[PDB]
Amino acid sequence: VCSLDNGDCDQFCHEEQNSVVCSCARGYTLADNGKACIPTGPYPCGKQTLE
């Protein structure tokens, strides 16, 4: 499932027990929907900075 649209994960996708499990990088929290990654701070890693 990770091989199609990244298992619908915003970031890390992993196939556990024949199902998808998403995870996020430090500074992000896995969304309630188990898919999206919500930034926790104003300067989250990987995001170009705006004014």
Binding site: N6, A25, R26, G27, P44, C45, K47
Partner: protein, 234 residues
């Protein structure tokens, strides 16, 4: 950086510059956290004692936002060597914490399996730095960034006069004149996925700069992800 374009304000926030006692930049780096900077091992003995500058887009103008930080510890990989440039990776712990803000932010560290299956399979990555704009020219006062395509190891090893270990990888073009150059070394090679950039390589070397039949050689960060976590203390 040869070719490509100048980085728009805030687009290369994770870019770090290694400065010598001449107060000039010789090698680049990538911000991984407030206390950490990722760079290339071969840069460490290229200025004896140096400092790290962040949030700098223009070395000409004092702009008004840069910052300086001294290295509290130098962590050179044990298997590093000048002959093959293998294990060309090192981490630097600053003495004072980088305060994130405009043009100053860390790139994301990705998980190994995922990065290999999804980031290394993307068509291209982004390289940046204050390096030479030409093979034998001068460095660029302006911070530049270039989109470089991933090249498969076989074509890579073949196009190379030197050995390509599984700790390095190719990126760039065969004849199209765009590439990283002296000065960029140690700098960031990140890959974009769903609007988030992850650290994927470290500018290492190359036979000249943007010549024909040659590509840019980079340290494969996926092969040192555990090493980095160790080096940064978990």
């Amino acid at each position: 950086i040869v070719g490509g374009q100048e980085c728009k304000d805030g687009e290369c926030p994770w870019q770090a510059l290694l400065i010598n006692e001449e107060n000039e930049g010789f090698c680049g780096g990538t911000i991984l956290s407030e206390f950490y900077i990722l760079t290339a091992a071969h840069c460490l003995y290229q200025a004896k004692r140096f400092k790290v500058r962040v949030g700098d887009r223009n070395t000409e103008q004092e702009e008004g936002g840069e910052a300086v930080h001294e290295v509290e510890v130098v962590i050179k990989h044990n298997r590093f060597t000048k002959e093959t440039y293998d294990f060309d990776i090192a981490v630097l712990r600053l003495k004072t914490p980088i305060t994130f803000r405009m043009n100053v932010a860390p790139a994301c560290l990705p998980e190994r399996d995922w990065a290999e299956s999804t980031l290394m399979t993307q068509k291209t990555g982004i390289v940046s730095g204050f390096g030479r704009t030409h093979e034998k020219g001068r460095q660029s006062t302006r911070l530049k960034m270039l989109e470089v395509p991933y090249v498969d190891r076989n074509s890579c090893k073949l196009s190379s006069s030197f050995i390509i270990t599984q700790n390095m990888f190719c990126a760039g073009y065969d004849t199209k004149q765009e590439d990283a150059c002296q000065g960029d070394s140690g700098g960031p090679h990140v890959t974009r996925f769903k609007d988030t950039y992850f650290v994927t390589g470290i500018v290492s070397w190359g036979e000249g700069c943007a010549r024909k039949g040659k590509y840019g050689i980079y340290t494969k960060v996926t092969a040192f992800l555990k090493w980095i976590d160790r080096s940064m203390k978990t």
